[PDB]
Amino acid sequence: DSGPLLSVFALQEIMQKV
Amino acid sequence: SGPLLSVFALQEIMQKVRQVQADYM
Amino acid sequence: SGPLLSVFALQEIMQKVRQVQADYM
Amino acid sequence: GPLLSVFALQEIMQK
Amino acid sequence: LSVFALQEIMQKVRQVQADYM
Amino acid sequence: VAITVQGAQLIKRVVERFYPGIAFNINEGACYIYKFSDHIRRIRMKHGTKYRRQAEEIIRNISLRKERLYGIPVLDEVEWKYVFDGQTFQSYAFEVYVNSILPWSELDPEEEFLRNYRVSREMTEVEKFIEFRAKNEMQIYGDIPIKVWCCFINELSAELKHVPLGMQVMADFVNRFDSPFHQGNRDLSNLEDFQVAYTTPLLFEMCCMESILEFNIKMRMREEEISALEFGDMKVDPVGLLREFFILCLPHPKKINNVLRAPYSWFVKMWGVGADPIVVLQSTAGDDRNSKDVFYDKFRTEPNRYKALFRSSFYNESRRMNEEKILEAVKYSQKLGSHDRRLPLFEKMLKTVYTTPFYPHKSSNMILASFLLSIQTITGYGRAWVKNVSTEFDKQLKPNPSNLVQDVSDLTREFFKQAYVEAKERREEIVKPEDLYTSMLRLTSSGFSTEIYVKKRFLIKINSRIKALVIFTKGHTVFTDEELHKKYNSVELYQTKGSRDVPIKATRTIYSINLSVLVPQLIVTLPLNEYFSRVGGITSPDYKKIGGKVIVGDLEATGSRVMDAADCFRNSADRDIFTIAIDYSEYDTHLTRHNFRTGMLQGIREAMAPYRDLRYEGYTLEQIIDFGYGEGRVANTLWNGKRRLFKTTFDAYIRLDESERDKGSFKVPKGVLPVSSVDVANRIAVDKGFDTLIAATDGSDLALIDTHLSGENSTLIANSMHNMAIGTLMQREVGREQPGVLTFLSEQYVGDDTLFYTKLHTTDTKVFDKVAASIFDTVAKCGHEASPSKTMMTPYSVEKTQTHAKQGCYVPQDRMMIISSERRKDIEDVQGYVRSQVQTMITKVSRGFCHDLAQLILMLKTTFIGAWKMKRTIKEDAMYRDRKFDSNDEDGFTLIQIRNPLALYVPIGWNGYGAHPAALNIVMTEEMYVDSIMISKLDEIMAPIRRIVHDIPPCWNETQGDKRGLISATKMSFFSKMARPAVQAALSDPQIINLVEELPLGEFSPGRISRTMMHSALLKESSARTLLSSGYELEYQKALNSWITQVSMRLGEESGVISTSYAKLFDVYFEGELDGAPHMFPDQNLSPQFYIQKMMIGPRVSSRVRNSYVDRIDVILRKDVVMRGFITANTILNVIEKLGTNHSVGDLVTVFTLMNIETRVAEELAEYMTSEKIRFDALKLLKKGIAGDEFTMSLNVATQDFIDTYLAYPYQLTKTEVDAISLYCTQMIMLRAALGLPKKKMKIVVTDDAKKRYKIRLQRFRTHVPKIKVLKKLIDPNRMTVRNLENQFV
Amino acid sequence: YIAPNPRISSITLTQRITTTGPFAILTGSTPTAQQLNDVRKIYLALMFPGQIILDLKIDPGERMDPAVRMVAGVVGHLLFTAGGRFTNLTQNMARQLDIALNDYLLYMYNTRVQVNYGPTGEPLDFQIGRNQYDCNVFRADFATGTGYNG
Amino acid sequence: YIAPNPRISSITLTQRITTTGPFAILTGSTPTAQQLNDVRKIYLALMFPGQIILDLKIDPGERMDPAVRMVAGVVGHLLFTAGGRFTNLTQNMARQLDIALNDYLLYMYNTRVQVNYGPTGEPLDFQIGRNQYDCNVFRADFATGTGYNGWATIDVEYREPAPYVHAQRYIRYCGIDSRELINPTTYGIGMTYHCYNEMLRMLVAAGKDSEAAYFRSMLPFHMVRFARINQIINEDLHSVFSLPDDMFNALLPDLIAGAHQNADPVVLDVSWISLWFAFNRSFEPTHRNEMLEVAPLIES
Amino acid sequence: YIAPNPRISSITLTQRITTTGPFAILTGSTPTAQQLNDVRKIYLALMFPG
Amino acid sequence: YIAPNPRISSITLTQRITTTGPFAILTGSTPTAQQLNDVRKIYLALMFPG
RNA sequence: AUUAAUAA
RNA sequence: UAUUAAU
């Protein structure tokens, strides 16, 4: 099975942390 | 106005996306 | 581009239009 | 900027 | 060439056809 | 195993074969090549120019391949003799073809389909006539050159380790005769230079289509793990059937194929109706037999009640004539071509058609049944030579006490009289004199012409005959005394017949009719069209009203053939229903004045009785019928068309007097010689020893027609009502002659087609024979005649309007040809054309085509569609710029652009096409791509796409959309007396114009509506678009220069417009198990990708779906035919948003009427907007084509039930947001079902964290209250959806 | 034929945007040609008292609308005379209008309004309101003319 | 199957825009094919009183819905007869409908509406309203028939000799006489019966004004439906194959007492939402049976 | 752990669109991981009384 | 070994109207080899009491 | 040519 | 207008 499909803001946070 | 999502950066951080998906599951 | 009409001015314009339409008919 | 209020919106656009 | 449809859905199709039979 | 990598490798090999020495890499978006031609240089030499290269350019590159222009190499195509790698075979089919080649001395000037005539180095008028016939009948058109098709076939044959027979035939031809013809890549309609015969392009097209069919059948049979098809239990070979059918047609393809259409379809229809145990799929619907509320549960087997009824005489005669037609076809093939081959397999199969069982639940039988219906597309379009034949008066059937002509006439009169009453009961009436000029807009070319002036703006004349332009210019000249009384039954007055190509059958005749004849017909036949337009009704014979019997709207009402024909499956699944389907032969020709016309005219006149006090420009209604259907208007018109030809000798021609050789006013073909009159042509013309063709020129070749015409305003309605009268007499006569035998439950008439759902109360063969004889006798006595070899009278089989149903299941047919087209295609916008091609492929796969083969075909097409479109741009130093006018370098060179095959899987908006590799019916948008690349199961499939997703150059689109600057100088002189009373009253005084200029009507205000209509009519014309798009290549060069190889996804689309990307504002998780029971559907024979989708998601059992604001407004505006092409839902939405929330319904009605909308549509719009005032959120939804295709409309998606059972979303959203979320959910569930993921429920999840809620609130505020609307003072703060935003996600 | 000022309807019938009723949905209609001819017939009946009278009809293709009945039940009692010295309409039309008025008066009835039904099952046989207004007087009776303009 | 005019629901059930209740949710739904089949089963049970009876079913994949339950509980007491002379349904179904009606009547209870509970813990055992309407009358009692269509109504009548001497009875649903031909456009304007009036009184007394308005405006549709059913029963189904009066009079006592000496009634099961769809559809016959005039010779 | 039918909240807590309150605010939320663990703790405490 | 008549469990009144049985899932199942052996054991026990 | 279904 | 289904 696949996981959750993240929103734009969560991906933005994962970008900005690194 | 709204946020702009770059495909290149998402492709770079795909491994961390997979990791956080695994943690949520 | 401009402000929205109110009820009053719009109804006045529409009343004039309807009177002219009735006269033409 | 900061999130607006719907009550301030009519004050601004009434001007 | 090979079939581009993977076996997971094809087994289900075979099962429902066998149930029809 | 991934389709992407194998398809990319295959298309790379195809490209490398087509252009030898090219470097085509699969890791780049496109490849640019230069082409050299010496045509322009030698004609530039006429103006005194010189070059240092002479002829060294060709020798430099043809064998050495060293021509490089600014670092980009120059190449050329591969010659025909090396297309198939030099292979050769000993195919007997090639020998059969070359034996069937005829000399020129066996010509028939008026032949239906051209046979195989030779090519000679000499050139007389005979070969010139052959050439003139071939140039406009052997055309391929299409969108891809046929040599690319041959190269793709070669590569696919190498890859599959299988060689088709058509490939063998083409290889054998090219191994000995080399180049058969030359075709232009830039313009595919430039066919020339026939070598061996004039039918070689047809031969190559037929071979390519046969190869495609063999590949399709092999792949489809491979998907199901079967090795052969079955006829009952006996094993058959589909390749053998296809080859034996292909070999027999070689001497004369179109004629033999058109002969053999009927027996194959008869065999497919009749197979299995007599097996003692029979297998059916149970169905259930309402009491009416035409009900669409059908659901399916399971298969079963039951004994056959009608087992003993198939030894009757009718079935024996049907089988015997169906065998005899095949026998004559075989005899003709064996005579024309020197061979003794036949069709042994089909002949063996046909002998036991009734008693051999058919299994709907077995793939090996359904696939064979579908295959037997699709092999008829090999011959391509039925382009033919249609000759003019006059109406032969002296054998039409006259009324007689032994006939029923008077009865059909009287019943037609009665039905026409009743139709007007039924239409008036729905408040639909004839046009009144106040609407005479307005109604002319409900009527492209005409018999008139006009001249107009246009001004170029970043003063020329053009000629146009379009109905809109000619009406707009000179509508007042149509309804005049001098024009209405003209009689078109002379040499100086006539019309002309047109021709339209159809996929398989012979060419259709088009009857162009003058506007002055069409207007009176419209005046008295518009209410009938409107009354019969709507769908649905009761089809029981005991029901009084006839609006339900006419089913002209029943088909194509919903965008799915399966949903619109569920009653066929239900009635074929039932054992109590006996179906009678009767077809007529030359139906239109049999509608004489004795049986059809006078009754119709009398009925119309008697229905026009209450309206006697009206006067239309001083004319009564009776004069209007006279002008519309009179003597010189319809009844006895003289029509011009193709010339009649005779064979004669040259010596007798020169021995003829000079006066008899006068060149008259009628043009003649190239190879024929002019002759003054028909009789003098007849006197000299001889059969044997012919060397000259002649034709008359004075006008005695014209044909006089007194027969129902297909170009009339009320053709379909009158045809269907005449069919209803025939069926009424049929029922009455069968009730009289055989009482109590047949009871009628349903009657349907759609023109020349009749369908009955009856119950049969007998088993004795004699009684059934008597009933059938009575039916045929009744049909014969009415003036028509029905062929017994095509009449259907059977249970367990229903066929209605190209839809087949056997034992409760769907038997599809594929006639969607992909190689050719009816006419030349000009690709103004590449992206839209590729989108439509993907739509067509979806339809084909839904009809039973192979999914992987369709994907391969699309990958082949997507690379070569846009090539050769650049002739002026020169790529120098990585810059795209205009060429210099004359030079030694850039003269005679063009740039070729070949796109990557993977561009088929790049979302629209990143210069790609929106297709998904998982399933063709899923549209790939930007957030769709992001979701796909976040799924671990799709890694191998999506890996090749990720390299080139950002490197796709922009597409050619000369119809960019914002076309402005073609201002016309001539003014519309018709607007004064056409405008609706609101517009006329507004224009009556200028102060009203000044006040309404305050209104936000804008572009459609009465002061400037005329120019808007005029421009919208002008840009509709084609040549005006060509003149306007002359300088588009500069804009394309600018677009290429400004391009940046970066892509990014956005949440909001524009100001006030949102899309499915709005769903990415939240997090999405699937959880919660659902029902695992598979669903039953009647349409078997699907690829596994579609089959799993229909198994996990059931068929649509709900009548309606969810709709958006834009869709509802558009559906309402579709009523106003006059204003349909000008006002869209976007304009109405902008108007109602420029008004506040504090508005009355009457104000909306009056402003909509001020925008020239009809009053009823204005009332509909106003009541709809008043009903939705509280819930209106003033947003527009942008659908990228999601769930709009043929197959997806048959699934239980985009419904309220689907939303209830699959989706959980926060209650705070507005309607448009819910629409976007629902579309996203539908597409994601379809993807998950396609990929084999478990069935779960989508849940929109928002936690209690303050930061994420603040971000969501800010984005929602931005979307609902944009800054640009605030600055322009366009936001209403008192709207409910705005006040709600205060406390949503705090 | 002249219409009144739309401000009356705006401030009275559509005064609140969160509710709806028969009058509210009927204010949105405009007459077709046949309805205008019917209006001409009504005025011709009015101009000739006694000599011309009216009756109600139903078109064969039409189906009956309840809001239209509810509105007509109130309008007809104020437009027409049905007894005393002359009449404008037949007894059947008066009976149908009385039934329509009865249906309108019980439309959105609630507890805070007091309804005490009468001994008989005839239409309009009840007392309504806190002060118990007697609605029996609005039933047609051609001898006295009660309930109409006369 | 005919549907009523949408104006009734538009001006009664969705009369307020800012509030959504059970009836407002149900009035915006669309039936599927299986629910139409259930409606057909319901009408077949209606046309054969006592011989075919109804029951409720739930699929193991289905789950219960509150709004559907309340709507069905209200509607079932008006569609069906549950005692007196015959029955349309089993005792379990009546019990479930009583519980659903009880759950609907206490849905949005507030202080100004007065509720006074009785001694027992039975459903519907309380007084409601300012005037204290007693709701105990609506609980099912098969011996007396109170709370359903047969409540205080003459359902079966014997008039005059019939062509088949073994079946003299006449069925009168809601007290309607089927000796007249009816015009569907204008029939039923001023008609009523006891159970419908009592239900309207109870709905008003509990504070359900919009629902009471909807049911008041839907009454002529109801009357036309039951007139059609009465005509179909009394004129089309009269045959030698109809049950004798002696056997007909004992169907309900045998069901109550649990006796099995005679044959038992056939039982069909339907879903909950099919009741709401059946109340809003009316059967309109368009084609009489083609064996109607040949039946006596076949019987002979 | 299973949630009830959403129609209950649709017809009881968020019935009126023109008003809000504490329950109407809390209806539109999903738990994080820590709150799910707290729910597990609550049920464990319930299954071992005292 | 003889199965009971299918008409005992269900009745059809019209084409689309049919009564449902309480043990539809069990009556549709088919035994395996081991279950058939168990049935044989049961009948052997019945035919030799004690 | 004529009506529909999608796309723009 | 573009494509396609049908007549």
Short mmCIF file of C-alpha atoms in Angstrom, two decimals, chain F residues 181-391:
data_model
loop_
_atom_site.label_atom_id
_atom_site.label_comp_id
_atom_site.label_asym_id
_atom_site.label_seq_id
_atom_site.Cartn_x
_atom_site.Cartn_y
_atom_site.Cartn_z
CA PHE F 181 4.12 6.93 -55.71
CA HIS F 182 5.40 10.17 -54.19
CA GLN F 183 3.66 11.94 -51.31
CA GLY F 184 4.35 15.33 -49.76
CA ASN F 185 5.23 15.29 -46.07
CA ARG F 186 4.26 18.94 -45.63
CA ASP F 187 0.96 18.39 -47.46
CA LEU F 188 -0.30 14.80 -47.51
CA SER F 189 -2.79 15.50 -50.32
CA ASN F 190 0.00 15.79 -52.93
CA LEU F 191 -0.05 12.28 -54.40
CA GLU F 192 1.54 11.81 -57.82
CA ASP F 193 3.82 9.70 -60.01
CA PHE F 194 2.05 6.35 -60.13
CA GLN F 195 4.41 3.68 -61.46
CA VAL F 196 2.66 0.34 -62.06
CA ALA F 197 -1.05 1.04 -61.55
CA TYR F 198 -3.37 3.84 -60.50
CA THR F 199 -4.53 1.92 -57.40
CA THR F 200 -1.18 1.47 -55.63
CA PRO F 201 -1.94 3.89 -52.72
CA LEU F 202 -5.12 1.91 -52.07
CA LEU F 203 -3.06 -1.29 -52.10
CA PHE F 204 -0.59 0.12 -49.57
CA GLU F 205 -3.38 1.45 -47.34
CA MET F 206 -5.15 -1.92 -47.45
CA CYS F 207 -1.95 -3.81 -46.60
CA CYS F 208 -1.16 -1.46 -43.71
CA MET F 209 -4.68 -1.79 -42.31
CA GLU F 210 -4.51 -5.59 -42.56
CA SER F 211 -1.15 -5.60 -40.76
CA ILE F 212 -2.59 -3.40 -38.00
CA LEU F 213 -5.57 -5.75 -37.68
CA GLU F 214 -3.31 -8.80 -37.34
CA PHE F 215 -1.18 -7.06 -34.70
CA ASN F 216 -4.31 -6.04 -32.79
CA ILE F 217 -5.86 -9.51 -32.83
CA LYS F 218 -2.58 -11.17 -31.82
CA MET F 219 -2.00 -8.81 -28.88
CA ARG F 220 -5.63 -8.99 -27.72
CA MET F 221 -5.57 -12.79 -27.84
CA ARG F 222 -2.24 -12.73 -25.98
CA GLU F 223 -3.74 -10.69 -23.12
CA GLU F 224 -6.26 -13.43 -22.26
CA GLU F 225 -3.85 -16.42 -22.33
CA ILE F 226 -5.67 -18.17 -25.17
CA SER F 227 -4.17 -19.55 -28.36
CA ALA F 228 -7.18 -19.76 -30.70
CA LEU F 229 -10.77 -18.60 -30.97
CA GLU F 230 -13.72 -20.98 -30.74
CA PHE F 231 -16.94 -21.33 -32.72
CA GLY F 232 -18.87 -23.10 -30.01
CA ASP F 233 -16.28 -25.76 -29.18
CA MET F 234 -14.53 -25.98 -32.57
CA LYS F 235 -11.19 -24.18 -32.85
CA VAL F 236 -10.72 -21.43 -35.45
CA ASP F 237 -7.80 -19.23 -36.51
CA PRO F 238 -8.56 -15.48 -36.77
CA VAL F 239 -5.42 -14.86 -38.85
CA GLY F 240 -6.65 -17.40 -41.40
CA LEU F 241 -10.04 -15.70 -41.62
CA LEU F 242 -8.46 -12.27 -42.07
CA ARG F 243 -6.04 -13.52 -44.73
CA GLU F 244 -8.68 -15.41 -46.73
CA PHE F 245 -10.89 -12.32 -46.67
CA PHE F 246 -7.96 -10.07 -47.64
CA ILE F 247 -6.79 -12.19 -50.59
CA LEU F 248 -10.24 -12.43 -52.18
CA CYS F 249 -10.74 -8.64 -52.29
CA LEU F 250 -7.53 -7.81 -54.17
CA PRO F 251 -8.93 -7.61 -57.77
CA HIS F 252 -11.61 -5.07 -56.73
CA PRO F 253 -11.43 -4.10 -53.05
CA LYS F 254 -14.25 -1.58 -52.59
CA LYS F 255 -16.86 -3.43 -54.67
CA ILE F 256 -16.24 -6.88 -53.17
CA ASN F 257 -16.01 -5.49 -49.63
CA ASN F 258 -19.28 -3.57 -50.03
CA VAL F 259 -20.91 -6.74 -51.37
CA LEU F 260 -19.62 -8.83 -48.46
CA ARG F 261 -20.58 -6.41 -45.66
CA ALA F 262 -24.10 -7.84 -45.29
CA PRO F 263 -23.52 -11.64 -44.99
CA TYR F 264 -20.92 -11.29 -42.22
CA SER F 265 -23.17 -9.06 -40.11
CA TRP F 266 -26.10 -11.40 -40.77
CA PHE F 267 -24.04 -14.36 -39.55
CA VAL F 268 -22.92 -12.49 -36.42
CA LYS F 269 -26.50 -11.45 -35.66
CA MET F 270 -27.95 -14.94 -36.21
CA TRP F 271 -25.32 -17.02 -34.39
CA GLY F 272 -26.67 -19.04 -31.48
CA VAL F 273 -30.39 -18.18 -31.47
CA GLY F 274 -31.40 -21.84 -31.78
CA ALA F 275 -29.24 -23.70 -29.25
CA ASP F 276 -31.38 -25.83 -26.93
CA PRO F 277 -29.57 -24.69 -23.76
CA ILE F 278 -28.77 -20.99 -23.94
CA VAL F 279 -26.72 -18.69 -21.69
CA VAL F 280 -27.97 -15.21 -20.79
CA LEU F 281 -27.13 -12.40 -18.36
CA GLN F 282 -30.17 -11.47 -16.28
CA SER F 283 -31.36 -7.87 -16.40
CA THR F 284 -34.15 -5.90 -14.77
CA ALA F 285 -35.81 -2.59 -15.60
CA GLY F 286 -39.21 -0.90 -15.65
CA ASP F 287 -42.45 -2.03 -17.22
CA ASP F 288 -41.85 -0.13 -20.47
CA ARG F 289 -39.56 -2.04 -22.83
CA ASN F 290 -37.61 1.14 -23.69
CA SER F 291 -36.71 1.87 -20.05
CA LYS F 292 -33.08 2.68 -19.25
CA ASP F 293 -33.13 1.87 -15.50
CA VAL F 294 -31.27 -1.42 -15.92
CA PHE F 295 -29.13 -3.33 -13.44
CA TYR F 296 -27.41 -6.68 -13.97
CA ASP F 297 -26.77 -9.47 -11.49
CA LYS F 298 -25.43 -12.78 -12.86
CA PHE F 299 -25.26 -15.36 -15.65
CA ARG F 300 -27.45 -18.44 -16.02
CA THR F 301 -28.40 -21.15 -18.51
CA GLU F 302 -31.99 -22.00 -19.44
CA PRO F 303 -33.74 -24.18 -22.03
CA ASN F 304 -34.75 -22.54 -25.31
CA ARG F 305 -38.49 -22.25 -25.94
CA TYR F 306 -38.09 -21.35 -29.63
CA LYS F 307 -35.91 -24.38 -30.45
CA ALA F 308 -38.25 -25.96 -33.02
CA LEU F 309 -39.12 -22.71 -34.84
CA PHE F 310 -35.93 -22.48 -36.94
CA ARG F 311 -36.89 -25.12 -39.51
CA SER F 312 -39.40 -22.65 -40.97
CA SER F 313 -39.23 -21.42 -44.56
CA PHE F 314 -38.23 -17.85 -43.63
CA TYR F 315 -35.00 -18.90 -41.91
CA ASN F 316 -34.15 -21.28 -44.76
CA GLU F 317 -34.62 -18.47 -47.29
CA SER F 318 -32.52 -16.06 -45.21
CA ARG F 319 -29.65 -18.55 -44.96
CA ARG F 320 -29.94 -19.48 -48.64
CA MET F 321 -29.75 -15.92 -49.98
CA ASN F 322 -26.96 -15.05 -47.54
CA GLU F 323 -25.02 -18.02 -48.94
CA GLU F 324 -25.84 -17.05 -52.53
CA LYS F 325 -24.47 -13.51 -52.20
CA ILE F 326 -21.17 -14.96 -50.96
CA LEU F 327 -21.21 -17.40 -53.89
CA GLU F 328 -21.61 -14.58 -56.42
CA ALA F 329 -18.81 -12.62 -54.73
CA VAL F 330 -16.52 -15.66 -54.95
CA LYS F 331 -17.43 -16.20 -58.61
CA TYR F 332 -16.71 -12.55 -59.45
CA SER F 333 -13.36 -12.67 -57.64
CA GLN F 334 -12.37 -15.89 -59.43
CA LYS F 335 -13.35 -14.37 -62.78
CA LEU F 336 -11.67 -10.96 -62.49
CA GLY F 337 -8.49 -12.38 -60.94
CA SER F 338 -6.99 -15.59 -62.31
CA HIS F 339 -7.41 -17.75 -59.21
CA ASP F 340 -9.61 -20.48 -57.76
CA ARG F 341 -9.45 -19.53 -54.07
CA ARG F 342 -12.58 -19.04 -51.96
CA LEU F 343 -13.60 -18.57 -48.31
CA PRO F 344 -13.72 -22.16 -46.99
CA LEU F 345 -13.67 -21.35 -43.26
CA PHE F 346 -16.59 -18.90 -43.31
CA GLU F 347 -18.59 -21.16 -45.63
CA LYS F 348 -18.04 -24.08 -43.25
CA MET F 349 -19.03 -21.89 -40.30
CA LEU F 350 -22.19 -20.46 -41.89
CA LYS F 351 -23.89 -23.82 -42.52
CA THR F 352 -24.60 -24.37 -38.79
CA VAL F 353 -25.28 -20.79 -37.69
CA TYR F 354 -28.61 -21.36 -35.90
CA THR F 355 -27.82 -24.40 -33.76
CA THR F 356 -24.24 -23.65 -32.71
CA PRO F 357 -24.22 -22.21 -29.17
CA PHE F 358 -22.76 -18.79 -28.39
CA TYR F 359 -21.11 -18.05 -25.04
CA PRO F 360 -21.19 -14.41 -23.87
CA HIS F 361 -19.17 -15.30 -20.76
CA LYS F 362 -16.28 -16.79 -22.78
CA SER F 363 -13.65 -14.49 -24.25
CA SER F 364 -12.85 -16.88 -27.11
CA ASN F 365 -16.38 -16.38 -28.53
CA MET F 366 -16.99 -12.69 -27.81
CA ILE F 367 -13.60 -11.76 -29.28
CA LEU F 368 -14.41 -13.71 -32.47
CA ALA F 369 -17.84 -12.06 -32.71
CA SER F 370 -16.29 -8.60 -32.33
CA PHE F 371 -13.52 -9.44 -34.81
CA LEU F 372 -15.96 -10.51 -37.53
CA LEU F 373 -17.53 -7.03 -37.38
CA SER F 374 -14.31 -5.02 -37.79
CA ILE F 375 -12.40 -6.60 -40.70
CA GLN F 376 -14.30 -4.40 -43.19
CA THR F 377 -12.13 -1.30 -42.58
CA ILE F 378 -9.21 -2.51 -44.73
CA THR F 379 -10.43 -0.85 -47.94
CA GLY F 380 -10.74 2.60 -46.36
CA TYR F 381 -13.14 5.28 -47.51
CA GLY F 382 -15.64 4.42 -50.23
CA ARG F 383 -14.75 7.22 -52.62
CA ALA F 384 -16.71 6.61 -55.81
CA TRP F 385 -18.19 8.04 -59.00
CA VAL F 386 -21.87 8.86 -58.50
CA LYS F 387 -23.84 9.52 -61.69
CA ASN F 388 -27.07 11.45 -62.15
CA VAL F 389 -30.20 9.37 -62.78
CA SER F 390 -33.59 11.02 -63.23
CA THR F 391 -36.75 9.92 -61.45
#
